[PDB]
Structures are given as structure tokens and as C-alpha cells.
Amino acid sequence: LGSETRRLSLFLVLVVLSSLGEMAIPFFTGRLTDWILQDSADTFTRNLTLMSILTIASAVLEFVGDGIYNNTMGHVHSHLQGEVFGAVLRQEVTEDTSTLSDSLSENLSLFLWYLVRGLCLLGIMLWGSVSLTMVTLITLPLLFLLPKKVGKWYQLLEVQVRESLAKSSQVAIEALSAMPTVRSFANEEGEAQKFREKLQEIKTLNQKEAVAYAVNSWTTSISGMLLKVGILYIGGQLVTSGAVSSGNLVTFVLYQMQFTQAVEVLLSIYPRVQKAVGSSEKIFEYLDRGLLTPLHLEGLVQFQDVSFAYPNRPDVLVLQGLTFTLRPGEVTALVGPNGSGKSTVAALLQNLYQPTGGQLLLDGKPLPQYEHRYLHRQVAAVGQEPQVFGRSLQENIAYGLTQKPTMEEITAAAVKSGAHSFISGLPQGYDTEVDEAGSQLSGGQRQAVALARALIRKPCVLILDDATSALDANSQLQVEQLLYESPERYSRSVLLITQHLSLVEQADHILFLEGGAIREGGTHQQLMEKKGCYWAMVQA
Amino acid sequence: QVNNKVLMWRLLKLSRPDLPLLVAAFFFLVLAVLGETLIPHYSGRVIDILGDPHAFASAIFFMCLFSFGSSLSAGCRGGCFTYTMSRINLRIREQLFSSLLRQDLGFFQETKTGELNSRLSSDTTLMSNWLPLNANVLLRSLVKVVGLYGFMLSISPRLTLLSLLHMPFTIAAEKVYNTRHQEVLREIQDAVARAGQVVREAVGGLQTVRSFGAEEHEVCRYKEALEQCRQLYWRRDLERALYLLVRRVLHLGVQMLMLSCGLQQMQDGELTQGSLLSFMIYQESVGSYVQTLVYIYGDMLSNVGAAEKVFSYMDRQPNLPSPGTLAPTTLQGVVKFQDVSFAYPNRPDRPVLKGLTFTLRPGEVTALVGPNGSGKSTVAALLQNLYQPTGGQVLLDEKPISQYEHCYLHSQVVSVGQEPVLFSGSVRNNIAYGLQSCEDDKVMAAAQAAHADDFIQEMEHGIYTDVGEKGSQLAAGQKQRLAIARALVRDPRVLILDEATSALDVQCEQALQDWNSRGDRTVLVIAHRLQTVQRAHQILVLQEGKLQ
Amino acid sequence: RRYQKSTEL
């Protein structure tokens, strides 16, 4: 908020000037009264011109100040929301800030305007007549106590009624969301009875709400009438005494009315400001809670005493002294216990988390030293849970790309992944937009889209896993055939964590891990024709 | 159109039982308006008298009496109207909810729950403000205006012509401003919803975004949405201030034209000082009512539209068949399927069943196996009179199932759902769901039939505890055994199991398939594997909608 | 800008 410290200051000037310009209609009015009892037109014309000029200037200044304040507040709100969302996304609520900012800004503006007005009115009244101002100040608190007491009770009753209505609403939505069971058990009358019993409780509160409303209205009217009468009596007696004229009394009466209105507005506005200020601290607290240049990688990776764990604590490690290694141009697969959590190794390959020990340098360079922008487009692959975003298919199949690929390149990537048929069969070509969060997607289509998104970037390492698990048997066979038929076995490194032994049959060197480290391995034919884990799994 | 008149007549008829309250409200409103109209006249006469104690005292007393009476009526009317509003709201909600329960299952399969919640929570309140709020303010506001202008014409037949000429320049401006605001608000709402959709999409696909490191693009898209919304916010904030400036300038001008003309008329000799004061008060006061009348008349149409939208749901006709009446005393339990074919109305002309035919017997425990695209669920559902078969017929004891009473049928035949659903009531209320009355002895007997007592009996007070919302505190296996106990508490004659053994114990399934509720009562079990073969007396496979 | 009063029921 500091960066806009100048503009706001300008606003804080203009309002003050406006608050002095609008106090010319009452004052001169009294002057006109003092003119009508002492009957030239020169003074009348002078008063008229002064009043008109001051009022016009006040209106213009108020307009300009309001424009400046709104323009600044819009930018502040947008910047705050952007920062909040960025922090939330990188951390791994949003609508709360959006619904809070407008209310906070509006209430703060009204509070400032009416506070300045009230200060100016009190000052001019005090300069006018000290005794009447003292009387008004003395009698203000005594006549502004009971209405607040009644209003708090009325507000409590209103909020109770609204909460009861919300409870009944759910009592109804829950019933209506499970219609097949209700119809099956023939229990519609029970639901109707429950709803009626819920409404019979609000029927009781509504009467007291109405009574409180009526009493509050009566109290407000009585206080409003009493306040004015109390000062009118003393003003009349003072005027009759002859110490002051009638015009001064008229100006004081108008000033007192405006001052009371300003005080009442301020009292009505303040609680909302307090609530919004208290609420913004929660958002604040929630928000407040360099690499070497890479050129090319040959696909050679290896690990020595590598360890990784969950972010919750380093004691949830799923690896201990691993020795995984995949040769460039060779495709290999890994196996292990279901509860061992070996899948995190794939995340370790994507540089999502730094190693807890040892090193995981690949292609002769440290793993976390390369640039993040170029590494993510050369070491990633299809995810474990295929999905399609709400963007266009031509953009969904190339998400996270610095430069949008050409139509021919996209078609070639889809064909290499088998997704060309899906693109051709989709209506309106690649310009069609897929449903948000895969609302209308299919397992085979999702697998094809994931494979295309993986292969579009020409990765130097493959971390494809669980893609065929969601895909069909025919799609899995096609993916395996494409992987096996790539030029010179794709001439790159693949470390796929396959779910079926059909893909692991042609593995260059299969391996299985236990206890956080690789415990067995070798050729697939040797593993399946010996005491290895693969043969035991096949026989079992 | 005449549709608005029809809706207005329906809304009038909905408030028929509120005559004793509306009469008092419309009496107090008239009293308050008549009291508030006459005060400035007596103020002016007092001012004229000051410039004879009897007349002064009379005027002061009358002014005080009118002020007090108006103050009282202005609160009595508000209380009465608030009570009337509340009554109308509570009356309409019950009718809306009780009309929806009779609809067919396709209506709920099609309509999103968000629309139902919106109708039952928001529009039923908007349509309830029509009579107590809009038709009240409009009436008093218009009447007050008529009275003020009558008094102004009485005081001075010449000065009122200027206000009569000035009024259109205010009416047109207010109309234009309201028209612009009503569309700016909805544009802002649409922009906000579109902005929130981006965050929702980012949340939905978080794993892929973190895997590819594409946060720096989602942030940019969100910033673009925010920058698109900020412009609409600024436009609205500018229009409001421009309107305020125009209003302030116009009023000062009118007052100065009024003040100058009034003074020039008084110095001639055709007017007095109190008369000028009263005329100034009236002319100052008329404008606020003139503006609020336009505001309220513009606002009433939204309530009328909301009422139309609510009434369009409770007037729709259902698709249930003709109600039945038959209710025999002892059902034999023989069920036959004859050339049954079915197509979902939501996705028509894509049949799931093609001439299915089979026969069931009391002791013949028949098992259905085969995936058929999960079509085993459809044959189970239509055996409970939940859907009507488009071809063939299904009959119970040589009579169609649709000919039996709705209340009677679901006592003899009951099925367990594939995914059990539990309600937020107590344990006893869930077991005895749908029954008129039950005894705790039966609940223990029903619970012991499913071995669920091993969990229920550790819990304090036994069966009177509150189950978590939609069974939140229960485990997947625990919910299965609770749903089973909900069936044998009813003593069924025909039993249908939707692969309960997939989560429940196989031995428990055998006991449920061989107890008194299954010794001579027809049992049909659905299995995803050959596990049902160990007891099935008539195994039946069906694929592509055709039986094996 | 100036405070706007809610319409009295």
C-alpha cells in the first residue's frame, strides 16, 4: 500500500476541501434570514454567487477525489489477489479475498468521508456558539444508548432466524440428493415430516423478530424527536433573551442536524470496517506461511547412496542406499513391494525434490544444477494419472510449452504416440476444446493425450508409468509396440515403471528393490528362468 | 405480457390466508401517511401566527398529536408487514419441497443439485418480498406524492408549475442510471465466475501442473482474468460518481430558482412567510419519493421473474405410471421376466436389455454374473418398480408389479444398494428407516443378523447415538453390514443383493443367503466373479443385453 | 459518496 502513498495523500487533501465547500448552503441560508428582517440587492446577489460557486466547487472536488481513490483501490485489489493466488499455487480461500476487498474499500471510503465531514461540522459549530454546542454534546450520549441496545437484540434475532433457515435448507438438500434410496424405501412422507418439523421452529422465532423490529422503530423515532426538541427549547429562549439573532440559530440548527446524521452514519459503518480488518489478517497469515546452463544430455544417469522422503518428515523415507542406473539407449523397468513407495524415485528423476543424501548427477552434470526451464522440457514424461485440461486440444496436447508447436509437428507427435486417430476422429479437428478436468474424456483418449504431451518435447529421459493401467489392453499393446519399434530403441533412456510383465519381457535389465534399495535384478529371461522375483511372480 | 398478470394473480392467491394481517397493515400505512403529510402546514401556520394564544395553542397541540400518531403507525405497519412476509416464505417453501418429492427419477438424474438448492434457498425468498415490500413502498410513496402536490397546488398555483416542468429531467436520469447499473452488475458477476473457474481448474489438475512446472502460466492466466474484472469495477465506480454530481448540480439550481421566484412573489404581496416555508419544505421533500417510486417499480420485475422461475418447477408433470391398489396377504414370491427390454429416457435408443427372459422361485437362489457394462444394476432396479420397462412385462404372482400399491410393494421386496448410503440420523433411525414404528428388540435381532453388533455395542447408549454426516465416521466395511441390517428388519419376501460379498464376509453372505429371511424367500444375488457358484441353484449369465 | 439508507419495510 506504500507505493501509492502520494496519490492517497492527494485524495486526503481534496476530501477536506470538499468538506469545507459543502458548508455554504446552511451558513448563507441563515444570512439570508438575517437579510429578510432588515430590509439592498447587492448583498443578496453577493450571497447567492458565493453559495453557488462554493457548492459547485465542492461537488467537482468530491467527484475528482472519488475517481482517484477508486482507481488506486482497483489496482491494489488486483495485485493482492494475484499475489495470494501465486503463493497458494506454489505452497503445495481465493474467493474470500475477492469478497472481502470490495467491502473493505467501500466501508473505508465512507468512514473517511463522514469522519472528515463530522470534524468540519463540529469545528464550525464550536466557532459559532459555544453554549449550544456544549448542550448538544452533553445530550448526545444520553440519547444514543437505548437504540443501540435494541438494535443489537434485533440483529441477534435476525441472525438466528437466518441460521435456522440455512439448517432447514440442508435438511432438504440432503434429502433430495439421495432420491433412489428414499423412493426404494417408500419414505417420502418421513422427509416431508422432517422438513415441516424444521420449519415449525422458525415459526416461533419470527414473532419475536417482528416485535423487536417494531420496538426498535418506536425507540429510534422517539429519540430522534426528543434530541431536536431539547435544543430547540434552549435556542428559542436564548433568541428571545436577545443575545443572538435568528439567523445564527437557523445555521446552528442545520449544522446540528447534519452533525447528528454524520455521527449516526459513522456508528453504523464502524463494525463492518472492524470485521473486515480482523478477517484480512487470516489471509495475510495464510499467505505468509539460479542454476547452471545446460546444453545437452546423453541420457546417462546413476545414483549412489540416494535417499528421499516425504515433505512431512525425513523419517518417511521410501529409499535407502539405492543404486538405480539406466544406460542411454536402453529401456529398463523396476518392481518392488506395493507399500515400499518406489514411485517417488520417478519424482526424484524429475528433480521435484532434492536428494536427502548422496548425489543423483546424470549425464556428467549435477541433477539440481541445470536450469529448471530447460530441464522440465527434456526429462519429463506422461504422468501417473492421465487427465485433460479445459483448454483447447491443440493446446492441451502441448501444455507447458514455451513455443506452440506447428500443426505438422503436433500431428507427427500424435501419430508417434498413436493419438493421430483420436485427433482426426474428434470433431472440428484440433481446434476442439476438451472438457474441464476430463469431464467428458475417456481412458484411451486420456492415455493418448498424455503420451502426445510427453513425446512432443522430445525428452532425453522417459518416466512413463501407470499410463497403460488407465488405458485399455489394445492401447497398452499399441504403446508397447510403439516403444519397441522406435528407431534404435528410441536412441534414448527409458526407465518406465510398468504395471504388467508384458512390457518388462523386453527389458534390457529388469530390477526389483526391497528395504529401500535394489535387492535383485538381471536379464528378464534369466529372471524368469531362475530363482528370481520375476519367475516367482509368474509361477504364483 | 399476460404471463405477468397470471403470475401476479397466482402470487395474490398464495397470500389469501393473510387477510387479518394485511388489513391491519394497510390501515396503519394509511394512518401514518396521512399523519406525515400534514405537519409542515401546521408548522407554517405557527410561524405565521407568531409574527391570540388560543390559535397558537391549538396549532401546537395538533402538530404534536399528528407527529406522535404518525410515529406510532410507522412502526406498527412495519411489524405487521415483517410478520406477513415471514409467513408467506414459510408457506411457499413447504409447498415447493413437497411437490418435488413426487417427481420421477429421470428428473433428478438430469437436473443438477445446484439448481434445486438455488430454487429452495434464494428464489423462494426473492419472490416472497413482492407484497410486503414492493407493493407497500410503491403504494405509500405514490400516495404521499399525490398529497404533497395537492398541498403545494393549494398554497401557490404558480410556483408548482416549475416543479411540474422540472420532474421529467429527474425521472429520465434515474431510469437511465438504473438501466445501466442493472447490466453492469451482471457483467461483473459473470467476470468473477469466469475468474474463479480458472482457480477451480488449476486445483483440479494440480499434479500435472506441478509435474510440468507450469505455475508461471496459470498465474499469468489468473492475472489476465483479474485485469479483465478490474475494468468493469472501475467503470461502475465512475458511473456512480457521475450520477451523484449531476444530481447535486440539478438540485441546487432548482432550489435557487425556487428561492428567487418565491421571494419575488412575496415582496409583491401575494404570499406570506409561513406559506413560503411550507412550500419550500414540500418542494424539497417531493424529489426523494419521485426517485424511490422508479427504483421500486424497477425492482419489482426481478421478484416477478424469480416467482415465475420457482413456479415453473412445481407445475411440471411427472412420468410415473398409474397408481395401483392391490395388496395381497401372503405373497408367494414367484417372479417372471417376459421379453423385457429397456432404454434409458436420458440416453434413448441405446437399449441395455434385449428381450431378457427368466423365472425365479422361492428356494431357487439365482445368481447373475457377467459384466455387460454394469448392466446387472439396471435389471435389479427395474424389479423394484423404479423404472418402467419399454418392452415386455415383469409380474409378481401373476400380476404386473406396477399394479401393486407403492407403500405395500416396498415391504415385501427390498434390495441393498451397490454403494450403500446412510443418513445423518441416529443409528436406530437408520436401521428402522421407513418403518412406522419399531422396538429395540427387533433392532438387536436385525443387527445380530449382520454381525454389526460387534461395532454398535461398544458405542455409548447403544443405538441412540448420532451417526456422522452421511455416515462419515463409519468405515467401508462397517457401512456394508449396517445396510444389510436395514433389510432383514423389514422381513422381506424377495431379496436382492448387489455384490455385498465384495466388501462383506463371504460366510456372512452365506448366512444372509440361508437364514429365515432367505430359507423360503426368493434371493437374487449379483456377483462379479464365480464366488456365487458355491450356492447358486440357477446361475444365469447375460451379455450385450442377451442372456447366455 | 454518501451513505445510502435501506428501504424501510
Residue numbers in the entry:
A (entry chain A): 180 to 218, 220 to 272, 288 to 484, 492 to 742
B (entry chain B): 131 to 181, 185 to 681
C (entry chain C): 1 to 9
Give the original sentences from the paper that presented this experimental model.
The biochemical properties of the recombinant protein were assessed using the 9-mer peptide sequence RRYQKSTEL (b27), a well-characterized substrate transported by TAP and presented by HLA-B27 (25, 40). ATP hydrolysis was stimulated in a dose-dependent manner by b27, but not by N or C termini–modified b27, consistent with previous studies. To understand how TAP recognizes peptide antigens, we analyzed the structures of TAP in complex with b27 and two other 9-mer peptides, all of which have optimal lengths for binding. These three peptides, b27, ILKEPVHGV (a2), and QYDDAVYKL (c4), are natural products of the antigen processing pathway and are presented by HLA-B27, HLA-A2, and HLA-C4, respectively. In contrast, the b27-bound structure exhibits a different TMD configuration with a lateral opening. In contrast, structures obtained with the b27 (9-mer) and b27″ (7-mer) peptides have a lateral opening between the transmembrane (TM) helices that connects the translocation pathway to the membrane. Although this gap could provide access to the ER lumen for bound peptides, it is blocked by densities representing putative lipid molecules in both structures. Nevertheless, the peptides are suspended in a central cavity surrounded by TMs 2-6 from both TAP1 and TAP2 in all three structures. Despite their sequence diversity, the three 9-mer peptides are stabilized in the peptide-binding pocket by a common set of interactions involving backbone atoms on each end of the peptide. Furthermore, TAP2 L377 forms van der Waals interactions with the N terminus of all three peptides, and R373 interacts with the main chain atoms of a2 and c4 but not b27.
